[PDB]
Amino acid sequence: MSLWVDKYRPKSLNALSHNEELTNFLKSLSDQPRDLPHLLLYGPNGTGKKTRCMALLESIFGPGVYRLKIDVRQFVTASNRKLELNVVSSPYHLEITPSDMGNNDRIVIQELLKEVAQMERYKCVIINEANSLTKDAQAALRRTMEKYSKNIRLIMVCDSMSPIIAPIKSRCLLIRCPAPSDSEISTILSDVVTNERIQLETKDILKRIAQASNGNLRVSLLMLESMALNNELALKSSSPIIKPDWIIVIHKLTRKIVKERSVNSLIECRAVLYDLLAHCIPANIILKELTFSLLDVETLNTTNKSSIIEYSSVFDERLSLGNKAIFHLEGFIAKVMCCLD
Amino acid sequence: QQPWVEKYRPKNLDEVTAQDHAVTVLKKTLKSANLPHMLFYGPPGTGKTSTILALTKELYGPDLMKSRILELNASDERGISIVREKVKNFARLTVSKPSKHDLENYPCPPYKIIILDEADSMTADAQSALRRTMETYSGVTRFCLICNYVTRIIDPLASRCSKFRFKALDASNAIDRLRFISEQENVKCDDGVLERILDISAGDLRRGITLLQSASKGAQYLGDGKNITSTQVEELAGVVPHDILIEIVEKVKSGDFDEIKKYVNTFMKSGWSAASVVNQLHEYYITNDNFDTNFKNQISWLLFTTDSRLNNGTNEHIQLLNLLVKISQL
Amino acid sequence: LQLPWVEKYRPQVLSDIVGNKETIDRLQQIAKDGNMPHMIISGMPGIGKTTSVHCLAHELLGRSYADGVLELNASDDRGIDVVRNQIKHFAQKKLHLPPGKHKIVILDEADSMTAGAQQALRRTMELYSNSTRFAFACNQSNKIIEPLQSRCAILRYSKLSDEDVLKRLLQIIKLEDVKYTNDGLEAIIFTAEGDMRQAINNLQSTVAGHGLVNADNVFKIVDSPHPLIVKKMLLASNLEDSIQILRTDLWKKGYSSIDIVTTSFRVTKNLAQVKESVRLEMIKEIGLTHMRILEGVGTYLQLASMLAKIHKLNNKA
Amino acid sequence: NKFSASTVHLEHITTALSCLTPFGSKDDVLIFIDADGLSFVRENNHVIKIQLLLSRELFMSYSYRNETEDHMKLCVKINHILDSVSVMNRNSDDIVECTLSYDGHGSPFVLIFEDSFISERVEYSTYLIKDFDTNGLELDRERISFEAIIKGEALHSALKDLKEIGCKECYVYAKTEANDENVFALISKSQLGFSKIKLPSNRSILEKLQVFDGDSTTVIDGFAVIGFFDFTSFDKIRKSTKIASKVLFRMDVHGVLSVNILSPGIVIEVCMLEKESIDEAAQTEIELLMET
Amino acid sequence: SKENLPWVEKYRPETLDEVYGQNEVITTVRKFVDEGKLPHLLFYGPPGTGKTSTIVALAREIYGKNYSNMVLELNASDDRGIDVVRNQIKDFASTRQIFSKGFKLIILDEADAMTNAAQNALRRVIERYTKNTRFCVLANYAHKLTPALLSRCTRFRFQPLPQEAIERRIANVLVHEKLKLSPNAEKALIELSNGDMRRVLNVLQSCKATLDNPDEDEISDDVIYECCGAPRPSDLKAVLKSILEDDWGTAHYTLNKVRSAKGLALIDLIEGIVKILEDYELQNEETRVHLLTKLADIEYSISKGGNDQIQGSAVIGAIKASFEN
Amino acid sequence: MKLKLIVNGCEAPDDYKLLRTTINTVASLRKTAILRFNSERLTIISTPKDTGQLWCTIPHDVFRLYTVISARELNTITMECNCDSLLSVFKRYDRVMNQGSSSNMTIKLQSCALGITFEEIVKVIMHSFKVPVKLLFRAQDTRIQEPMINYIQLMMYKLPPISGEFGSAFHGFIRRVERYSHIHLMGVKKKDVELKIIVNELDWHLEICWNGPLDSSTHEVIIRCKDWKVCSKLYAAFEEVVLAISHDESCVFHCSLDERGQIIYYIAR
Ligand SMILES: Nc1ncnc2c1ncn2[C@@H]1O[C@H](COP(=O)(O)OP(=O)(O)OP(O)(O)=S)[C@@H](O)[C@H]1O
Ligand SMILES: Nc1ncnc2c1ncn2[C@@H]1O[C@H](COP(=O)(O)OP(=O)(O)OP(O)(O)=S)[C@@H](O)[C@H]1O
Ligand SMILES: Nc1ncnc2c1ncn2[C@@H]1O[C@H](COP(=O)(O)OP(=O)(O)OP(O)(O)=S)[C@@H](O)[C@H]1O
Ligand SMILES: Nc1ncnc2c1ncn2[C@@H]1O[C@H](COP(=O)(O)OP(=O)(O)O)[C@@H](O)[C@H]1O
Ligand SMILES: [Mg+2]
Ligand SMILES: [Mg+2]
Ligand SMILES: [Mg+2]
């Protein structure tokens, strides 16, 4: 098929190449599915928490977990505004699509969790990216898992679980999924290239891919895919590690900020920021990447770096409550220019 | 069967372990019919829902659950009009007629109880509309408000409803309860596992019960017959090891930005929650007696600011890096 | 059945109305001439706008105004269709009016009337302005759409001076034959702040609750206005004096925190002695305290922190 | 069951309850249960009160088992009761039986219907928390301004014409004549102008009309009584007089109006509240224009 | 009717003489109704002052048997829109008398939640129909009311209940049910009242259930402080002394021991510290500014939630650092 | 694109043909309806996506001179037209039931318009009405909008057309529910069976129990919306008997059988 992300995906629970402590812990959890409480997974993005959830479902239910079952449901909010959600269905479990807007998120969650509950074995619900809720959907999930804790199980995967409210963190078991080290990523890549028998003279490129993706399985696999198809399935030690337009644009913006510090530079930074933000993206990761790229400049000293990180934290706090993002982004950029100049 | 959180949920008023005052007030109310409006508040997972359910079970009974009890939550629509009409309709219904069996067995009060959970997330207009319904219709009905945020409830509601604070379930407040649960479920602890679980838990018993259940499941799966140690519950609780915290403190002590940033990145790629790291760093810094007063005050202020930032739904990596940089430069 | 002084002693002719000599003289002149075009009357409430309009209509028409006009106020269904139909019928039905007289459409509290009704009124004027004229009684002219005001002569009523309110108070006192004290009258004027209706209500309350009108009785029944107290609080030099004033004037008197914040914001908007930077800093602090109050924290500590931060930004170390 | 009432002819109950439908947002009826019978009273904004009385002889199984002061109350909805009895009693020779039950206090209002081996049981929970009791827009008969007895058909035509034309404000005129030329009409003012619905003066359908001097015994001729009534109050009695035989009009000097509807037959009593004051001095021109 | 209701709705005044504290307002209203003139009374004040109880008692005293018909009660419980004020209020305030020529009273309880258009319609109603009907407006926030309405309504300020009114009501409650209360507990209840009758009644109802024997015993400071959970003044003084003389170790240990001995809350400790520090003499004003700002920030953070140990150490550090000036 | 057929008066199929009009009022009130003309005697029409499913077949074999042909390759052709204009042709044809048998109903598919020919006589009057829109859809939408769905078990056989009071009871449910403005059903396998409908509200407790009706696992509790008011109108079916099936606690069907064709309605949870 198309990508290594979904093709050579670990099917069975015994086919995990990562650390065995988490696998043993979830095997202990899956030993008695009747006594299994509500579960919450937190860790770095791209670690593969959904893979652990699918493996746990395989251990509890059995074969047939992966079923397409594309379904479309209609939901009505207050006044009159039709909403559409391409929620994915499956036997014995269902996954929630968080693609809906945060403001009108109560109706879909309430209706679909009531539909999965009914009155009646149990059916499990997987809710990815639970941090996007405005605490109203969080309260809805809290009440649903409190009152109907007889036939429903919630298994949520998320990264940077701080916005998740305290009551939910108390009622759900905390699963930690640390990102694999460079050795495990290199072993996985070696297994892949042995499976397809592609050309490979030096293993240093595998370590470069492993360490350049910051411990992300999907990013490393896709980076391997990009260079393999562009080199006629023949990796070379002299082949540079390519990066998306995202990192190139971020680095160019950082270089422009460091070099040129002026109002004209500020409005070109505004144009670049608008061009980036035109692709339906959150600004927290953009601010984090800009801060990390600014701290990577060798010409800066410790005082400028300290000021940059302090104002980055302050403007991230401002963005946490702010409705817009361009205000805080431009404020952080202007503060960085003021500090550098 | 059932998870230990719901399997061991109290069903009687005397099954509580720490909230003595509210429970004994309700018990002395059981022989009377002058129950006032109650405002239950406190830390999460202190058993306010369990307490109100036990009180309702002692008062009315399963026959009168479906006739004299209305519960409104966030699971359905909670608009101004819907809440207004529903509360006006239910708070106007006449006194129900219990059977002779109910009167013979349980003391049936002549009033009805309306329970409104998570009242903190209710709009001010709804509370203003419900003020007069609570006041002038209270002859044969009562309202119970349960919320973990007192400030989210406006001043007039805090006056009509009796304020029943729920104490934080500390170590000694739940040692006996965890011991009873361990004996009932055959869970073995060596010296201080239960005390360690309550120390880890933020003043609640539900998280501790879940942690104990996870530890018991792990011990049963291991099958070697040994007892649970403090290291196991610390690992399953997300507690940072002491050696790694010592390494963090040592790297912060050195005044270099590059090594600190690299180690912060290496720590964040492990996916550890920053709140636990902040708490462990704070308790280590206060516990240590090698620092003077000004440094302790400054680091306490920075830790409080970082905790507020983290609780405000911000990024853990940036906040922890900023906190460690600020600490290193003191 | 004792009718209250606000309704019992309301003026019936334009002669008894005081406060704006030029405007009353203009109204008398335009009534004597009779050529009264459309107009909009706006001002702060309690200055004598709608009663002036009613008196002008009275002494301009008489029996014709009493029997054959259609006066609409805010206590009616002010929908687009029904108002359109009603004014359309009222534009018709002409009588044997004098050549220098025209029908008057009294419009009381038109600030809350929908824009479609304003457009319907525009069409009604442009179609039958020859037979009838429109009179507008409102608080501010901003709520009236732009095209309506182009067809009318806007008249603005200034705030009543102390002399006119004092003269009206003496006339009402002579009519009622009640003892008074100059200190009590000065206190009544100070509490009214140019509000005639508030002054009448305060004087009536003093007379009916204590008898002789005195400064002590007025201060007992009603305290000083909160804008003055807040203005004195914001201009205090020492923080301890400001804290004591705040406590003993609003916390011990039963004043809500959100009302205190709103009054502080209103005072800071209209303050003039402070610099622009100080004014904007105080506005920012007031807004921060307001959002803290709205989010739930409504304790005295927030007000104390606001006062402390205001004093800190005023002193600037 | 502490209450029993069996009804076969549900058409009479259907048309009786249909007289209370013009009330907007119909609810909160204070049904009275007594040995004399069942009386339904409904008030809207404490300005108009209507009482509908059902006699004991109307029900063939009236028992009223009680050991109290014979004054018991319950509050339920109108729209539930109004649509409860109208749905059945269809086809021919169905002899539908309606059963009323109420277990004293705190029990739902039980309605049982039987129609060709088909059984229903409808329960209405009562609202008896803040029943203020007392109430009543009654009046004393010692100071009745005037009394009038008119046919239902004559008044129904006047009210029907009064509604569709509009006439948000209506006037009631009463005037006697020594030559037995009594004058009584329902005139009103609207956007159309002046409407004069002059009721007939002959004895064919106007049984009696006399004007008192505030003593209810001293009849006086040539005096005029002017009543200023809201249109909303008149719209409620329009359908009540649609099916009626005789309509009785009685008002006092205090301004309240009592309307008795006769249709043994049942009696419907409607009480109304006069408006504040006559617009301008229209009481002068009402006498002047009608006399012309 | 009695012995079946909460203590809040058990001692509600029924006559004008049963309302304490606002003696001037009661006397002025009594003079108003003795003369026979109601100047559109408007009641403003904090909750628990007794505005609605006073106005209901006054209406009962004026009317008697006419309360059911001629008196109209309005609130936020029922719908109050533009149509409601346009139709129901206009219809009610347009009728004549029935048995007595007394005025018509309409009770606008918690009227601050009405819309601006509804408020404008309401004030055009009060101006037009004032010759027979006088409205009464009850609200707690004057900023939500249209300023034109305040001009047409006689504003009366409801001050917080003084010490003598609270003591008189406490004595009346004790005499009715034959309950003994210690003077120290009386002073504690005076301090905790903060001018609120509902709070006093609610805590008095719960303290009755706290005692094992309802009679033949008294209520001391320990029972009062255990019932509601408020910190003892001695505990607050000890905490402040430990913070002042001990820097972090034994001070933090003492704070933790105090908080864990009974289950004290951080918020109530914060009001205790600010109450015992308001009378302190600090002639620098920078310590005062720092204390107020940092304590307000900590209270806001606690209201938003967080770690109890972190916030307690923040309070300790703020108090120690501010006093260093 | 030749879609030409003739509809003529008769004795038996007119009641089946006049039964089509009742939905047309509802279908016009709804969004629209789809059509699929196949072969010479099979065509399926339903309401596209509430949950309005009205799979119903009509035996066009008895119809005279009917032929379907289109450029849709396979035997199934997507067809859709607005049902509001269908009322006009049926209502006006219903007024001429007094006289006129040779008028017929000539329909011609031309491109968008469907001319309808009338030959009513009062000296003859010719009427030529045209259907406004016959717009088709995507060929792939035919598979995703398949209306053929049926279930088994828990068969309630309705009361045979001997007593007319059974239909009036269902017609009573039509008028009452419109006047108030959830519905619960019961099912039992104990022999004739009994039908029970119960409505639960805050203060409205309606329950109807049938003592001795002639209609024919257990405890099939189900909670559904008020969309069943349509299905009661389909029960009339004076020519034949109607079937009803309800099970699985989530879905219910109303199998209306008349002549060869059958009509079913689907209700979701
Ligand atoms: N006093 C107690 N004794 C024993 N178990 C308790 C006690 N209080 C709470 N629990 C346990 O806590 C759980 C019930 O707590 P909940 O009532 O659901 O939490 P909570 O009080 O609703 O907190 P919220 O609603 O999130 S603020 C059960 O597992 C109980 O066993
Ligand atoms: N110049 C004046 N002389 C005497 N009485 C006055 C004067 N102006 C106002 N009043 C009194 O004010 C009361 C009502 O005045 P209004 O005209 O209704 O107030 P207003 O200025 O129109 O403000 P609004 O918009 O109507 S609330 C009556 O009792 C009048 O007697
Ligand atoms: N002066 C008083 N004397 C005696 N009891 C009082 C007094 N003021 C209040 N109370 C009691 O407090 C209870 C509640 O106060 P209410 O008068 O009903 O409401 P309120 O004080 O007006 O505050 P709001 O504005 O309605 S929230 C009353 O039922 C009385 O029992
Ligand atoms: N134990 C494992 N061994 C090999 N690959 C793994 C393992 N766990 C996860 N992966 C890889 O992770 C990818 C899926 O990651 P995903 O679940 O999308 O991460 P996240 O849950 O953070 O979004 C798969 O393509 C799979 O190859
Ligand atoms: Mg709960
Ligand atoms: Mg005016
Ligand atoms: Mg009140």
Curated annotation (Swiss-Prot), chain A:
Residue sites binding ATP per the record: V5, S17, G43, P44, N45, G46, T47, G48, K49, K50, T51, R218
Record has Zinc-finger as a keyword: no
Major localization class: nucleus
Subcellular location: Nucleus
Single GO molecular function: ATP binding
Cross-referenced CDD domains: AAA
Signal sequence coordinates: none
Keywords: ATP-binding, Cell cycle, DNA replication, DNA-binding, Nucleotide-binding, Nucleus
GO cellular component: Ctf18 RFC-like complex; DNA replication factor C complex; Elg1 RFC-like complex; nucleus; Rad17 RFC-like complex
Other information: Present with 5040 molecules/cell in log phase SD medium.
Task of the protein: Component of ATP-dependent clamp loader (RFC and RFC-like) complexes for DNA clamps, such as the POL30/PCNA homotrimer and the checkpoint clamp DDC1:MEC3:RAD17 complex. During a clamp loading circle, the RFC:clamp complex binds to DNA and the recognition of the double-stranded/single-stranded junction stimulates ATP hydrolysis by RFC. The complex presumably provides bipartite ATP sites in which one subunit supplies a catalytic site for hydrolysis of ATP bound to the neighboring subunit. Dissociation of RFC from the clamp leaves the clamp encircling DNA.
The protein, known as: Replication factor C subunit 5
Organism: Saccharomyces cerevisiae (strain ATCC 204508 / S288c)
UniProtKB/Swiss-Prot annotation, chain C:
Molecular functions per Gene Ontology: ATP binding; ATP hydrolysis activity; DNA binding
Domain of life where this protein originates: Eukaryota
Main location class: nucleus
Keywords assigned: ATP-binding, Cell cycle, DNA replication, DNA-binding, Nucleotide-binding, Nucleus
GO biological process: DNA damage checkpoint signaling; DNA repair; DNA-templated DNA replication; leading strand elongation; mitotic sister chromatid cohesion; sister chromatid cohesion
One matching Pfam family: AAA
Subcellular location: Nucleus
Gene3D superfamilies membership: 1.10.8.60, 1.20.272.10, P-loop containing nucleotide triphosphate hydrolases (3.40.50.300)
Cellular component GO terms, alphabetical: Ctf18 RFC-like complex; cytosol; DNA replication factor C complex; Elg1 RFC-like complex; nucleus; Rad17 RFC-like complex
Amino-acid positions noted as binding ATP in the UniProt annotation, renumbered to this chain: V6, V18, G43, M44, P45, G46, I47, G48, K49, T50, T51, N139, R197
Protein purpose: Component of ATP-dependent clamp loader (RFC and RFC-like) complexes for DNA clamps, such as the POL30/PCNA homotrimer and the checkpoint clamp DDC1:MEC3:RAD17 complex. During a clamp loading circle, the RFC:clamp complex binds to DNA and the recognition of the double-stranded/single-stranded junction stimulates ATP hydrolysis by RFC. The complex presumably provides bipartite ATP sites in which one subunit supplies a catalytic site for hydrolysis of ATP bound to the neighboring subunit. Dissociation of RFC from the clamp leaves the clamp encircling DNA.
Note: Present with 2760 molecules/cell in log phase SD medium.
Protein name, as recorded: Replication factor C subunit 4
From Swiss-Prot, chain D:
GO cellular component: checkpoint clamp complex; nucleus
Subunit structure: Component of the checkpoint clamp complex composed of DDC1, MEC3 and RAD17. The interaction with MEC3 is performed in a RAD17-dependent manner. The checkpoint clamp complex loads onto DNA. Interacts with the DNA polymerase zeta subunit REV7. 2 RAD17 subunits also form a heterotrimer with one MEC3 subunit.
Molecular-function GO term, any one: double-stranded DNA binding
Species for this entry: Saccharomyces cerevisiae (strain ATCC 204508 / S288c) (Baker's yeast)
Disulphide connectivity of cysteines: none
Keywords: DNA damage, DNA repair, DNA-binding, Hydrolase, Nuclease, Nucleus, Phosphoprotein
Transmembrane segments: none
Top-rank taxon, per record: Eukaryota
Tagged with keyword Transport: no
Keyword Nucleotide-binding (UniProt): no
Note: Present with 189 molecules/cell in log phase SD medium.
Lineage: Eukaryota, Fungi, Dikarya, Ascomycota, Saccharomycotina
Descriptive protein name: DNA damage checkpoint control protein RAD17
Location(s) in or outside the cell: Nucleus
Task of the protein: Component of the checkpoint clamp complex involved in the surveillance mechanism that allows the DNA repair pathways to act to restore the integrity of the DNA prior to DNA synthesis or separation of the replicated chromosomes. Associates with sites of DNA damage and modulates the MEC1 signaling pathway and the activation of RAD53 in response to DNA damage at phase G1. The complex also physically regulates DNA polymerase zeta-dependent mutagenesis by controlling the access of polymerase zeta to damaged DNA.
A single GO BP: double-strand break repair
Full-protein residues shown: 9 to 330 of 401
Swiss-Prot record, chain E:
GO CC annotation terms, alphabetical: Ctf18 RFC-like complex; cytosol; DNA replication factor C complex; Elg1 RFC-like complex; nucleus; Rad17 RFC-like complex
Gene3D superfamilies according to UniProt: 1.10.8.60, 1.20.272.10, P-loop containing nucleotide triphosphate hydrolases (3.40.50.300)
Alphabetically ordered keywords of this record: Acetylation, ATP-binding, Cell cycle, DNA replication, DNA-binding, Nucleotide-binding, Nucleus
Gene Ontology molecular function: ATP binding; ATP hydrolysis activity; DNA binding
Highest taxon listed in the record's lineage: Eukaryota
GO biological process, one term: DNA damage checkpoint signaling
Classification via SMART domains: AAA
One Pfam family it belongs to: AAA_lid_RFC1
Subcellular localization, as worded in the UniProt entry: Nucleus
Sequence positions that bind ATP: 8-12, 20, 45-53, 140, 198
Biological function: Component of ATP-dependent clamp loader (RFC and RFC-like) complexes for DNA clamps, such as the POL30/PCNA homotrimer and the checkpoint clamp DDC1:MEC3:RAD17 complex. During a clamp loading circle, the RFC:clamp complex binds to DNA and the recognition of the double-stranded/single-stranded junction stimulates ATP hydrolysis by RFC. The complex presumably provides bipartite ATP sites in which one subunit supplies a catalytic site for hydrolysis of ATP bound to the neighboring subunit. Dissociation of RFC from the clamp leaves the clamp encircling DNA.
Family membership: Belongs to the activator 1 small subunits family.
NCBIfam families to which the protein is assigned, alphabetical: PRK00440.1
Other facts noted in the record for this chain: Present with 3140 molecules/cell in log phase SD medium.
Annotated protein name in UniProt: Replication factor C subunit 3
Species for this entry: Saccharomyces cerevisiae (strain ATCC 204508 / S288c)
Gene: RFC3
